Amino acid sequence: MFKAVLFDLNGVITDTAEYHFRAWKALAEEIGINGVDRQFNEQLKGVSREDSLQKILDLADKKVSAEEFKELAKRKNDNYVKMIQDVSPADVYPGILQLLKDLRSNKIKIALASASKNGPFLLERMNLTGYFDAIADPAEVAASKPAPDIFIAAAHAVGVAPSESIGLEDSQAGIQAIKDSGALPIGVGRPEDLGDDIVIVPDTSHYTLEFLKEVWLQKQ
Numbered sequence: 001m002f003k004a005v006l007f008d009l010n011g012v013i014t015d016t017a018e019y020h021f022r023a024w025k026a027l028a029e030e031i032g033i034n035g036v037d038r039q040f041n042e043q044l045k046g047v048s049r050e051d052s053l054q055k056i057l058d059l060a061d062k063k064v065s066a067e068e069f070k071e072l073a074k075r076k077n078d079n080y081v082k083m084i085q086d087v088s089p090a091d092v093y094p095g096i097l098q099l100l101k102d103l104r105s106n107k108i109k110i111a112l113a114s115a116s117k118n119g120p121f122l123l124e125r126m127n128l129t130g131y132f133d134a135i136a137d138p139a140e141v142a143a144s145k146p147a148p149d150i151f152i153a154a155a156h157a158v159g160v161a162p163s164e165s166i167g168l169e170d171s172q173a174g175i176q177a178i179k180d181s182g183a184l185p186i187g188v189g190r191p192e193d194l195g196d197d198i199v200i201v202p203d204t205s206h207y208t209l210e211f212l213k214e215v216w217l218q219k220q
């Protein structure tokens with residue numbers, strides 16, 4: 001049986017997307033750029049901070065220096081960090097706490113494999129830290145998703161090979177990173193985004209220990 005589960009954070013454990021959206025919208029309002037609404041924000045999901053800022057500048061054909069660019073990106077981040085201060089246990093997605101409890105009770109390792117530089121903070125705010133055996137630090141990997149680095153790191157940190165692990169992800173790049181690590185992906189979302197060659201569940205309430213076991217046994 002699998003020995004570890006490698007969890008992404010955003011779209012698996014909780015949603016930070018609302019806060020990202022609000023942070024960008026506030027920045028755009030401050031600098032006078034129209035058009036940063038919820039529909040536009042879909043173009044920012046899974047996009048780097050710098051590429052997201054550039055998309056917003058492009059709305060106004062706005063040109064800035066490297067130092068101005070850096071400062072704007074910083075201000076967005078400051079907005080975001082302020083906005084996540086009220087994250088709480090109520091923000092944990094359905095099924096996730098029970099899964100964490102059941103993994104722990106069965107001595108299956110639990111690791112975070114998130115791109116978030118606020119991962120430890122967010123897990124503390126949600127009261128989840130006690131379930132995690134390790135958090136892979138995204139600042140210490142050489143390459144971001146879809147590179148496998150973060151999943152390799154997460155598995156190794158809990159003393160397992162990726163081949164002994166399941167990865168849980170909501171993004172295409174995440175799924176590719178799990179695949180390339182050697183771990184078994186189980187997506188949450190739709191195959192249009194994630195691919196049709198992996199198991200996908202419609203929402204996190206389907207991530208149960210019994211389901212993970214079923215998936216692992218079918219893989220063999």
Ligand code: BEF
Nearest residue numbers: 008009010114115
């Ligand atoms: F937290 Be993951 F990188 F969406």
Ligand SMILES: [Mg+2]
Nearest residue numbers: 008010011170
């Ligand atoms: Mg995610």
Ligand SMILES: [Mg+2]
Nearest residue numbers: 047048050051
């Ligand atoms: Mg690039």
